[PDB]
Structures are given as C-alpha cells and as structure tokens.
Amino acid sequence: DWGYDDKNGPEQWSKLYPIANGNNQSPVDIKTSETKHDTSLKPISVSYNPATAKEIINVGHSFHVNFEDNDNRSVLKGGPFSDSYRLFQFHFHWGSTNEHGSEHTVDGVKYSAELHVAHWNSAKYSSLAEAASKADGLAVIGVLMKVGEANPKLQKVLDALQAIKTKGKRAPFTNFDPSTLLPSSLDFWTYPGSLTHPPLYESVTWIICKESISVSSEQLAQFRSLLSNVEGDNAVPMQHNNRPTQPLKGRTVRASF
Ligand SMILES: Cc1ccc(C)c(NC(=O)Nc2cc(S(N)(=O)=O)ccc2O)c1
Numbered sequence: 001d002w003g004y005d006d007k008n009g010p011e012q013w014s015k016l017y018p019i020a021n022g023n024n025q026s027p028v029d030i031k032t033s034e035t036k037h038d039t040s041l042k043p044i045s046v047s048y049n050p051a052t053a054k055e056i057i058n059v060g061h062s063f064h065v066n067f068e069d070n071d072n073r074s075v076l077k078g079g080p081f082s083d084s085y086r087l088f089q090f091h092f093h094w095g096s097t098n099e100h101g102s103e104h105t106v107d108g109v110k111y112s113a114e115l116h117v118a119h120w121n122s123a124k125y126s127s128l129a130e131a132a133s134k135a136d137g138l139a140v141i142g143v144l145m146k147v148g149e150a151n152p153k154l155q156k157v158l159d160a161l162q163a164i165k166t167k168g169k170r171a172p173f174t175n176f177d178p179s180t181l182l183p184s185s186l187d188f189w190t191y192p193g194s195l196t197h198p199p200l201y202e203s204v205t206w207i208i209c210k211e212s213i214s215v216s217s218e219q220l221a222q223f224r225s226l227l228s229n230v231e232g233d234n235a236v237p238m239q240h241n242n243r244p245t246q247p248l249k250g251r252t253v254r255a256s257f
C-alpha cells in the first residue's frame with residue numbers, strides 16, 4: 001500500500017520499491033542549458049481514434065481515462081521511436097496549491113499540473129502487462145499545465161468526474177480524442193525514465209512538450225475535489241499526487257528543437 005501522504009508518500013517508496021533510488025527515475029528537472037539538440041529526432045506523430053475511449057476510473061490516488069488497446073487504432077509514432085506505440089491511458093498530476101503540481105520541472109520552474117498520455121510498445125510486445133516492465137515498453141507524452149485561462153478542451157474530462165467521485169468508482173467515457181488536449185507545437189524533450197509512482201518501472205521513454213497548456217485555478221479545484229475514500233466514508237480530498245524530481249544520474253535530455 002502506497003500514496004502521497006506522510007507515511008506512505010514518495011519518501012517511503014523505496015521501502016517496498018528499491019528501484020525508487022534507481023538510475024532512470026522520473027520525473028526530472030530539465031535544464032535547458034544542459035540539453036543536447038538531436039537532429040535524428042523525427043517529429044511526434046499522434047493518431048488517435050475517439051472510438052477507442054473507454055472508461056474513467058477513480059484509482060484513489062488519481063483518476064485514469066483508459067482506452068481500448070486491442071488494435072492499432074490509436075497510435076504514437078516518430079520522435080525517438082522506430083516502433084509504433086499504442087495509446088492506453090491518460091491522467092493528470094496536481095499539487096496542494098497552484099504554486100506546484102507538475103512532476104517535471106523546466107529550469108527549476110514548477111507548473112500547476114501535468115498531463116500524461118501513456119502508450120505501450122505493440123510492435124515488440126503483446127500486452128500492457130508484458131510491456132510495462134520492459135526498457136522500451138512504455139512511451140509517455142508529458143504536457144506541463146500552467147495556471148491561467150480556463151481550458152475548454154479539458155471540459156468533458158472535468159464533467160465526467162461527478163460520476164466517479166469516490167475511490168474505486170468507474171464510468172464509461174467514450175468518443176474522446178485526447179490529442180485535442182495536446183499543445184499546437186509538438187517540440188519536445190526526450191530522456192530514458194520511469195513510471196512516476198509504484199511500481200516505478202524504468203520502462204518509459206518520456207516525451208516532454210516545450211509548449212505548455214492552460215488550466216484555470218477552478219479547474220484545478222475540480223481535480224482536488226475528487227475523493228480518495230470509498231463511498232459512505234468521510235471525505236478525504238485528493239489534494240496532490242506529484243512526485244518530487246529525481247537525480248538525472250548522468251542521463252542526457254535530448255531536445256528536438
Ligand atoms: C501496477 C501498475 C502496472 C503498470 C502500470 C502502467 C501502472 N501504472 C499506473 O497505475 N499508472 C500510470 C502511471 C504513468 S506515469 N505517472 O508514470 O506517467 C503512466 C501510465 C500509467 O498507467 C501500475
């Protein structure tokens with residue numbers, strides 16, 4: 001059992017998960033003076049089918065929007081990949097206040113939230129369960145979210161939260177293309193990393209967008225409005241779910257720009 005509280009939070013994660021102190025841990029601080037431009041990086045190509053949208057689930061520490069991943073209807077290609085990767089999920093991370101909330105930071109700057117759009121290597125592997133722990137198994141697009149104007153594209157997601165207010169609650173969530181949440185420029189950083197929460201597998205090639213997306217202070221309050229408790233128990237709001245940044249351990253962050 002793990003979380004983002006005092007006793008079960010990021011600090012204690014190595015007790016159950018020793019890879020927490022590994023050499024390919026996420027998230028990281030992207031230092032733009034220390035990044036290395038790479039001319040071999042292809043553009044990011046996302047092509048999602050809105051019909052693959054499936055379900056929204058309250059997982060206690062966060063909420064997930066899951067996607068049907070039986071075929072290649074919704075794929076990521078390009079960037080640093082020769083393989084095609086299949087969309088399975090998106091979710092968010094946020095903080096207790098507007099001051100923090102993102103997982104990744106750029107030149108020490110914390111943003112208010114972060115969108116993760118996650119994919120698995122369907123070219124090399126047969127399932128998410130198989131891919132999830134492979135070095136080249138996962139591809140996650142990270143988009144930093146800056147507090148400002150209300151993001152209208154965020155609407156269908158925020159509206160759906162009313163149906164999944166407490167832990168374990170789930171509801172159908174259909175006909176949504178999550179590339180509509182992505183910024184207009186897909187200029188990016190890329191580095192070898194991990195899942196940002198248990199089980200923390202070093203299976204993720206991160207794609208971090210240069211361009212942020214907006215979110216209002218009230219849209220953030222909707223995230224924090226979700227409850228970590230089961231129905232009938234007294235309310236425990238999901239205040240924050242971001243992991244602190246991790247030492248790069250000689251890894252190199254590549255820029256596409
Ligand atoms: C037990 C187990 C096995 C396999 C996976 C994928 C998980 N992961 C999750 O529950 N969430 C998650 C976190 C990230 S993130 N925050 O690192 O971008 C990306 C994709 C996600 O699915 C857990």
Ligand SMILES: [Zn+2]
Binds near residue numbers: 091092116196
């Ligand atoms: Zn995440």
